[PDB]
Amino acid sequence: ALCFLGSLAVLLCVCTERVQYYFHYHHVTKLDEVAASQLTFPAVTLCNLNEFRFSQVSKNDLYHAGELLALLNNRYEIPDTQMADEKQLEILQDKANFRSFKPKPFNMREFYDRAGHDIRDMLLSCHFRGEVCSAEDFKVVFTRYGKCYTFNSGRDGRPRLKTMKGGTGNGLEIMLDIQQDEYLPVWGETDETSFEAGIKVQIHSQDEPPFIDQLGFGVAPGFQTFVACQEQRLIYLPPPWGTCKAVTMDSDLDFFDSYSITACRIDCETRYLVENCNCRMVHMPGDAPYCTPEQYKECADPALDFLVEKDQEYCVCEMPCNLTRYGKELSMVKIPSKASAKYLAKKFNKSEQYIGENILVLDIFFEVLNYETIEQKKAYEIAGLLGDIGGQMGLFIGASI
Amino acid sequence: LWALCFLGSLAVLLCVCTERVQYYFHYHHVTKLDEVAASQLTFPAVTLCNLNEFRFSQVSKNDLYHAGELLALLNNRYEIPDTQMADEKQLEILQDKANFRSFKPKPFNMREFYDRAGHDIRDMLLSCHFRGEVCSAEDFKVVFTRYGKCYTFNSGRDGRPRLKTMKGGTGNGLEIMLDIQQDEYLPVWGETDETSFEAGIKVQIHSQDEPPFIDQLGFGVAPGFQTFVACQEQRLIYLPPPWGTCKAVTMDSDLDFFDSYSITACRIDCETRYLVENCNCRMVHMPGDAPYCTPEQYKECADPALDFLVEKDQEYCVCEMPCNLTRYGKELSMVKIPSKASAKYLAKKFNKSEQYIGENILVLDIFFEVLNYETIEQKKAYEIAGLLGDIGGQMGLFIGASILT
Amino acid sequence: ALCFLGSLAVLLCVCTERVQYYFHYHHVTKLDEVAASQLTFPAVTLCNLNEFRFSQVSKNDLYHAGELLALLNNRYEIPDTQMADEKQLEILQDKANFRSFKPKPFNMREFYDRAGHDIRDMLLSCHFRGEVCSAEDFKVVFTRYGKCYTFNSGRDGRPRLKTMKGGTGNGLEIMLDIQQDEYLPVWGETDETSFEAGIKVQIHSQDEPPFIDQLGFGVAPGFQTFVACQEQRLIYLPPPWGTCKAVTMDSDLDFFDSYSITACRIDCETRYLVENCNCRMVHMPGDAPYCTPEQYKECADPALDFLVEKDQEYCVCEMPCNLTRYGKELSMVKIPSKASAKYLAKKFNKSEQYIGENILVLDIFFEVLNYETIEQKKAYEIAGLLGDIGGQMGLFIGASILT
Numbered sequence A: 001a002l003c004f005l006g007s008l009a010v011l012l013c014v015c016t017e018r019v020q021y022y023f024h025y026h027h028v029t030k031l032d033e034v035a036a037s038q039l040t041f042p043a044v045t046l047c048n049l050n051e052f053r054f055s056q057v058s059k060n061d062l063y064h065a066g067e068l069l070a071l072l073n074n075r076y077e078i079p080d081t082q083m084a085d086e087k088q089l090e091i092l093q094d095k096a097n098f099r100s101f102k103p104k105p106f107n108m109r110e111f112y113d114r115a116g117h118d119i120r121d122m123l124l125s126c127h128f129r130g131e132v133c134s135a136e137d138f139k140v141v142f143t144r145y146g147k148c149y150t151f152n153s154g155r156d157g158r159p160r161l162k163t164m165k166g167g168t169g170n171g172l173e174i175m176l177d178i179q180q181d182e183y184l185p186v187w188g189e190t191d192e193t194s195f196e197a198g199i200k201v202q203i204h205s206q207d208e209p210p211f212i213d214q215l216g217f218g219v220a221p222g223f224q225t226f227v228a229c230q231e232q233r234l235i236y237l238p239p240p241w242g243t244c245k246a247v248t249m250d251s252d253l254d255f256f257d258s259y260s261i262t263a264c265r266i267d268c269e270t271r272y273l274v275e276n277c278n279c280r281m282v283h284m285p286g287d288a289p290y291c292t293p294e295q296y297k298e299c300a301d302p303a304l305d306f307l308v309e310k311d312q313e314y315c316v317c318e319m320p321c322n323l324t325r326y327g328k329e330l331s332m333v334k335i336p337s338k339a340s341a342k343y344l345a346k347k348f349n350k351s352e353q354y355i356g357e358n359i360l361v362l363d364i365f366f367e368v369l370n371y372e373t374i375e376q377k378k379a380y381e382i383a384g385l386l387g388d389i390g391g392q393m394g395l396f397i398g399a400s401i
Numbered sequence B: 001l002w003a004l005c006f007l008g009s010l011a012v013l014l015c016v017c018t019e020r021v022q023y024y025f026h027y028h029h030v031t032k033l034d035e036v037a038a039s040q041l042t043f044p045a046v047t048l049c050n051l052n053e054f055r056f057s058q059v060s061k062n063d064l065y066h067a068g069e070l071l072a073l074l075n076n077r078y079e080i081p082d083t084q085m086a087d088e089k090q091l092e093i094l095q096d097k098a099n100f101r102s103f104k105p106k107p108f109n110m111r112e113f114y115d116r117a118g119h120d121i122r123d124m125l126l127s128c129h130f131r132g133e134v135c136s137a138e139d140f141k142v143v144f145t146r147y148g149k150c151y152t153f154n155s156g157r158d159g160r161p162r163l164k165t166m167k168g169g170t171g172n173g174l175e176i177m178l179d180i181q182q183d184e185y186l187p188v189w190g191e192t193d194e195t196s197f198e199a200g201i202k203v204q205i206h207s208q209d210e211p212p213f214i215d216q217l218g219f220g221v222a223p224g225f226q227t228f229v230a231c232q233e234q235r236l237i238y239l240p241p242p243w244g245t246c247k248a249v250t251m252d253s254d255l256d257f258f259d260s261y262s263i264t265a266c267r268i269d270c271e272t273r274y275l276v277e278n279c280n281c282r283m284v285h286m287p288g289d290a291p292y293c294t295p296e297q298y299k300e301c302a303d304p305a306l307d308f309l310v311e312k313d314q315e316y317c318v319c320e321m322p323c324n325l326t327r328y329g330k331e332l333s334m335v336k337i338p339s340k341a342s343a344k345y346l347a348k349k350f351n352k353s354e355q356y357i358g359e360n361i362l363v364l365d366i367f368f369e370v371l372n373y374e375t376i377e378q379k380k381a382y383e384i385a386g387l388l389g390d391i392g393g394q395m396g397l398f399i400g401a402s403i404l405t
Numbered sequence C: 001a002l003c004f005l006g007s008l009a010v011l012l013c014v015c016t017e018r019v020q021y022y023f024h025y026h027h028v029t030k031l032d033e034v035a036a037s038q039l040t041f042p043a044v045t046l047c048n049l050n051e052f053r054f055s056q057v058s059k060n061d062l063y064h065a066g067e068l069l070a071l072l073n074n075r076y077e078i079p080d081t082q083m084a085d086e087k088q089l090e091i092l093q094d095k096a097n098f099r100s101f102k103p104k105p106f107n108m109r110e111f112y113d114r115a116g117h118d119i120r121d122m123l124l125s126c127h128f129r130g131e132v133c134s135a136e137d138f139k140v141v142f143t144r145y146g147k148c149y150t151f152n153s154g155r156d157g158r159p160r161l162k163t164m165k166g167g168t169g170n171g172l173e174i175m176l177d178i179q180q181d182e183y184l185p186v187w188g189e190t191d192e193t194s195f196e197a198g199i200k201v202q203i204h205s206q207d208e209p210p211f212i213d214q215l216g217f218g219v220a221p222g223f224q225t226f227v228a229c230q231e232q233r234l235i236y237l238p239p240p241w242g243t244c245k246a247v248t249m250d251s252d253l254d255f256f257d258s259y260s261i262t263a264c265r266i267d268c269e270t271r272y273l274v275e276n277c278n279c280r281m282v283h284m285p286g287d288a289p290y291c292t293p294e295q296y297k298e299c300a301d302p303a304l305d306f307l308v309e310k311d312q313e314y315c316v317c318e319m320p321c322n323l324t325r326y327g328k329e330l331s332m333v334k335i336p337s338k339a340s341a342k343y344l345a346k347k348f349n350k351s352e353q354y355i356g357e358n359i360l361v362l363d364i365f366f367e368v369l370n371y372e373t374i375e376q377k378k379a380y381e382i383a384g385l386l387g388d389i390g391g392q393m394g395l396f397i398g399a400s401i402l403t
């Protein structure tokens, strides 16, 4: 009959349509809602928006950094501009008196470490799953805001805390004093001053460095702020199926052991400033020298701004393959109640007015022992291609007998 | 040979037959996501609670005598404490009520106290509209929670029909103006489970088939703001063992004190059991027929026990996912109230000071972004019916090949 | 044998089960996260909550609109209710003196345009991806709130701005003065007055008109407000697979180029008011006459409220098939810090108290170079039905070859 010619014509033609499918390298995305007996609680990094406490700024610091913080002009004088408070201008005309004064050596990293807000003074109260925690439970981390702190860091081999139930009771609750009376006076616009009072916060996997100035959320004074979270786990496929970049212990990055958009970007930033400024900012990795006030103002602040705003050539940062995202729903209530104000004032030896202006509470917790997963899977595996081609080859071989 | 082209035909069906049985016995599932365009949505329940549990003006000498220690207004010696964290004018009203010379205790009930001294929705609710229809205090059913006397709008309880949203946007939702009544806030002289540092309300948006769990799962709304809450209905289906870990939701709940299964119901059940076992009482907000805890039992046994339970213990409370489950995505945003312009009008309209309006008025708009719910349904991967429809057709061609040769 | 009796019965039976599947018209929904080198930054429309600046309300305006703004009663005189500010009641008793006064002609649209807050006065500062922008980067748009503004409108052939990187640095940051001292005094409840200070904001596709009073979010004075966004792209299938309405070269709407729930609704609203009131509101399209204060109060305000609240018959607006959604996470910090207050006061020649009451900052930006897609795809295509019927027709033609 015609059947052996028309069985070879259809087999070899349909066989090359299951090979044109494979070589397109399709993927398919599986969504799931996994019920979880327990979840790993994330890292919570948090920063005061004020970088330098006024009371920690020495004559020597003012001498070196005063122009960078717009407290001095280029002539080491307190400016013509009377943005100053009367009582503040007295304290500062003193510090800014440089007659007979001999400069001592100065280091931006030291200054940040010494003058940065102290978690020990800021942290009025802290609880996790009902257990008390202290300033010892927060590891120091440097960010563009300066001396910041990470709760449940996972760093120093201490074990990562876990959430076993839904609701606020199985989460973090911290009361802070943002210390507005230590806020450095703002007499000019710079990258180191802000118009704002409160803290920046980032909730992130322990495996990701914080990127708090770009990806953080804000928490205001005078409110208890509830943050209800949801763990989202995302898997992506490498080339040729997608564009992602393996998360392993061989990062392939100058300054990081594991790949992450954040690590990739901090790497790229650090490289760029070292190349163009011959220094790194106090928060960047490597062993390059720390920038001086002059270098911050003249080279580094502008360069870093140029980089994260304009330049699109220098920073090529691809998706990681493993990635953990946190959905957040914020809500707030006022603190303090008219009733509670006097108790809080007395409990902390502050004015009632001060409590209103400086106290906040932050509750971070999960809605439900559940994570969304969104995994990209290979559409048509190479194994399953030879398991069709094996069965295509087996019946045209059964047509010859 | 011609019988061997048959022997390679039998080896393939018996081998592939036990690979489609090893697949079935793995009990795989597959998850279908969908974005159904909806003519109509059932508007959820909205439970809301003042953060202040007891109005100061409702606390009698008898109440202060029994509960004063629990609310840190008294020490264990029925005296106003050493530490003068009191306001001068406030302390005057209380010196009187706290005078217990000659006084004989009269009978006292935590449930009654909560009911009598709790904020009245009738006094709190300055204004309320749903899809442009007016509603009053009559539209809010009373419910007891750890915060005390709370209220649920669109409860579905008392056979009243569940309200529906037919368009997106704020205009087809709830808008309520409240006065949180800070001047009735019980003075806070010490830390307890019944006092808070905060003013405002807690709110929970939830299915009518869920009891509220407002202290754990609620969101906050502050005074001095209009707060927009833009919602999205999410419907989740899960598969029971052996495919998953869920426990079917029907009207045969299988729970001591509840109509339908829900993590919330399951947890309140488990909490009620635990306190009865370890305290020989229930809290005013728990179901069952056990006696209500006394202030003494609240302070000594129940408050610490319930805290122990929801914080530390992971032995006692095994509460599994329901199979049917309704979630609400929310985006909150706010504007200031009142404007400098509106302040005098609101003061006059409600016979309050301008300062008072600033401190006590809030507006809440709850509404849906779009006539749409997300569904996320787990479906059985390989049904048992479709297994007999493969193994019957696997068995039927080699029995067709042995009949020929 | 019995094989030809059993083999045509199985073709015809399986054939009509794969035709009962097709005629059910199933669909399947594909979810994805695509890694994006770049995204189109959306439109950002924003409105002051105060519709008419006090200082722009002329004697002529008060004469025509005073009742609509509850500054006059139905006898076009100032009410005797002593619930004005003392100094405001003076300025207004003056304006409200109509002895000797000759009416000049009046237009709600002109009034809105003239008395609406000026983006040029409100916009203290504005940056996108670090580049400076001015009042000229915001196109005027009329909404129920009145004179509003859209950033990155895409209108007037200007090109749509793009986001290249995640985080606040690659987004919009605007500092506003909401001008509370220009807020029209509230002596009564109407659809044009509000109890609230701040702005309403909507983030939306450039292809969608804003629907800011219904679908907007609020931004309060005295805070920097971070809005972190996520682009969600939704595809739906038309009947018989679903209920959507394909976006074409013919919008199918009297007054819009492209279909969109928002366009569809504004269309339907415009039709309804013209039919029932013989006017349109200043923010509606078409060529109908603009409503007068009297028409606003008596017919149009109540009609539009009736429409968006109660009526369920008149406005049949079905899902578009192509559709862009923006997930948002808001957070805020206080402005100004005790430290910054005097600098801001001096920089803008305002009191320190004023700064607290009127200044806000808004940052709109994307968390990650990623959009979620949710595409409905046809379950069983009509092509693939003839490719199964062709393979069942091929083996009983192999069974009639034997017999």
Ligand SMILES: *[C@@H]1O[C@H](CO)[C@@H](O)[C@H](O)[C@H]1NC(C)=O
Pocket (backbone or CB within 6 Å): A235, A247, A248, A322, A323
């Ligand atoms: C990476 O993802 C896989 C899931 O495919 C998971 O098993 C593993 O825990 C993840 N590892 C890291 C380092 O993120």
Ligand SMILES: *[C@@H]1O[C@H](CO)[C@@H](O)[C@H](O)[C@H]1NC(C)=O
Pocket (backbone or CB within 6 Å): A349
């Ligand atoms: C409390 O603070 C005051 C400032 O108001 C200070 O002078 C005093 O020494 C402090 N006293 C105690 C008891 O801490």
Ligand SMILES: *[C@@H]1O[C@H](CO)[C@@H](O)[C@H](O)[C@H]1NC(C)=O
Pocket (backbone or CB within 6 Å): B351
């Ligand atoms: C207004 O309130 C006060 C109570 O503080 C009262 O003296 C006055 O009589 C009230 N008038 C009313 C409700 O009209």
Ligand SMILES: *[C@@H]1O[C@H](CO)[C@@H](O)[C@H](O)[C@H]1NC(C)=O
Pocket (backbone or CB within 6 Å): C207, C235, C322, C323
């Ligand atoms: C939908 O329209 C948008 C907006 O212009 C465009 O990006 C997209 O390509 C369209 N896609 C489909 C499948 O209609």
Ligand SMILES: [Cl-]
Pocket (backbone or CB within 6 Å): A047, A048, A049, A050, A051, A052, A116, A117, A145, A146, A147, A148
């Ligand atoms: Cl700091």
Ligand SMILES: [Cl-]
Pocket (backbone or CB within 6 Å): C127, C128, C129, C130, C168, C169, C170, C171, C172, C173
């Ligand atoms: Cl910017």
